[PDB]
Design a protein around this ligand. Sequence first.
Ligand SMILES: C[C@H](Oc1ccnc(-c2noc([C@@]3(C)CCCc4sc(N)c(C#N)c43)n2)n1)[C@@H]1CCC[N@H+]1C
Ligand SMILES: Nc1nc2c(ncn2[C@@H]2O[C@H](COP(=O)(O)OP(=O)(O)O)[C@@H](O)[C@H]2O)c(=O)[nH]1
Ligand SMILES: [Mg+2]
Length: 170
Amino acid sequence: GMTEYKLVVVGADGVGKSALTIQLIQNHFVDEYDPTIEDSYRKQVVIDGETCLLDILDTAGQEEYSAMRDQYMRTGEGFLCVFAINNTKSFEDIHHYREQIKRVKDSEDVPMVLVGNKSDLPSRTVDTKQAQDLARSYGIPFIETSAKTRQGVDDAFYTLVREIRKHKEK
Ligand SMILES: C[C@H](Oc1ccnc(-c2noc([C@@]3(C)CCCc4sc(N)c(C#N)c43)n2)n1)[C@@H]1CCC[N@H+]1C
Ligand SMILES: Nc1nc2c(ncn2[C@@H]2O[C@H](COP(=O)(O)OP(=O)(O)O)[C@@H](O)[C@H]2O)c(=O)[nH]1
Ligand SMILES: [Mg+2]
């Protein structure tokens, strides 16, 4: 049967979670998508020759640590932790998102990719080296993306699928 991969996109308001998700789903840059909409979206894709079904949860809205929200996030098999390369605060938030993922998955080994979005913009404030080194501290991949130009979009989601596969095979 066709394997389905449940991917969750997390990170600060405004980093481009929805834009990245919609590039994957629609193959179009959407520069405006209601920042409060949290929803999931499926797409069939071929990854290393295997046709699979991606189910992407684009997170949004208020921070809340209820049993219900934990349960919803726990359905994710892998997580994209997204910051914007022109927003230092969004990068400094990453460790909090990673810590909450570890907690809800009750695992130190959750499939995860660090994503530096908005790579098309010249106003960089987070060095690539610092981001690469954070990914190295966590032992996870780092992908540079632009939802505007589609740079890195497949790389981010497909790498996360590969990380889920690796984890399932252990
Ligand atoms: C960086 C923070 O800000 C925000 C703002 C919005 N969201 C968060 C946030 N952290 O983790 C999560 C997710 C969605 C991630 C996946 C796993 C779980 S499990 C659960 N219950 C979740 C929730 N709500 C989450 N989201 N953090 C700073 C610093 C602390 C206070 N704050 C001002
Ligand atoms: N230049 C540029 N703008 C982006 C990119 N991704 C998102 N944006 C803009 O960043 C803002 C927030 O994007 P959005 O997808 O709503 O982020 P979310 O809150 O993380 O879902 C909007 O003004 C988008 O047009 C990108 O890669 N490049
Ligand atoms: Mg959004």
